[PDB]
């Protein structure tokens, strides 16, 4: 099907405790495949890449570390901040491709202290700046033709390496694992009970779990936990509704997931 490659980069200053820590983590879909960490004292399909690959990536990481360190200094200035506080620069970049491996779209965006700062537009040619500080960055990047370089990476390197990773990791990356599901029932009081619909062991993380009553969505009355990692590549999620005792059969749990031959409809089975 369709796939993505995304890097999630975090630089954080720590005045009095050395230079800012830089970490970059790479993913294909919901699978982490590499991690670079400036404080350091990878996936199986990536291990086959060898020395040319690692040296070049290690080299790029070191240079990026230098650059993000000077960016942090500049950002402190743009916002009139003292040298005493910790600050965070983040970026997310990568590409989405279709089943045929062609570029669907590229991404390169940045945030400072948790707030959107600047992003490359979908056209891969212009920027959207969040505020007057980011407008200075935009000015600089327009002058230095940065979008052209980022576009080259996104259209070229990103798509070409995503294709290779998918080929090398096809047995896992191209495999969707369907959820294992069940419905549990717990009395709350004499007059109410909780019905909880479980989805376990699924990959990728994307899933839809809903409760219906008489076929109408119970969006407001459903408690839905955030999808959470099991630790073994797979994910988990549940949705719960409180229902009047005796009315359990008016409620159905619906599950949509890529790994399922077809959508599930589940009911409590006493």
């Amino acid at each position: 099907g369709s796939h993505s490659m995304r890097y999630f980069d975090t630089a954080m200053s720590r005045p009095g405790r050395g230079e800012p820590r830089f970490i970059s983590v790479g993913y294909v879909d919901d699978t982490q495949f590499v991690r670079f960490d400036s404080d350091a004292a990878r996936a199986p399909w990536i291990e086959q890449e060898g020395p040319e690959y690692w040296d070049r990536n290690t080299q790029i990481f070191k240079t990026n570390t230098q650059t993000d360190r000077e960016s942090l200094r500049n950002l402190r200035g743009y916002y009139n901040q003292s040298e005493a506080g910790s600050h965070t620069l983040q970026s997310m970049y990568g590409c989405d491709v279709g089943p045929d491996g062609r570029l669907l779209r590229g991404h390169n965006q940045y945030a400072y202290d948790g707030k959107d700062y600047i992003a490359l537009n979908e056209d891969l040619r212009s920027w959207t700046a969040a505020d007057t500080a980011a407008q200075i960055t935009q000015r600089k990047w327009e002058a230095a033709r940065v979008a052209e370089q980022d576009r080259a990476y996104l259209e070229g390197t990103c798509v070409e390496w995503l294709r290779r990773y998918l080929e090398n990791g096809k047995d896992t990356l191209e495999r969707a694992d369907p959820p294992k599901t069940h419905v549990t029932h717990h009395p709350i009081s004499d007059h109410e009970a909780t019905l909880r619909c479980w989805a376990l062991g699924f990959y990728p993380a994307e899933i839809t779990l809903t409760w219906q009553r008489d076929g109408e969505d119970q969006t407001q009355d459903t408690e839905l936990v955030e999808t959470r990692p099991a630790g073994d590549r797979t994910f988990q999620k549940w949705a719960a509704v409180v229902v009047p005792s005796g009315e359990e059969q008016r409620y159905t749990c619906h599950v949509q997931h890529e790994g399922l031959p077809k959508p599930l409809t589940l009911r409590w089975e006493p």
Binding site: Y7, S24, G26, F36, Y53, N57, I60, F61, T63, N64, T67, D68, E70, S71, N74, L75, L89, Y93, N108, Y110, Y117, I118, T137, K140, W141, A144, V146, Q149, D150, Y153, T157, C158, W161
Partner: peptide
């Protein structure tokens, strides 16, 4: 594969 940062912010 990592992208090199083109220019400081």
């Amino acid at each position: 594969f990592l992208r090199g940062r083109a220019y400081v912010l």
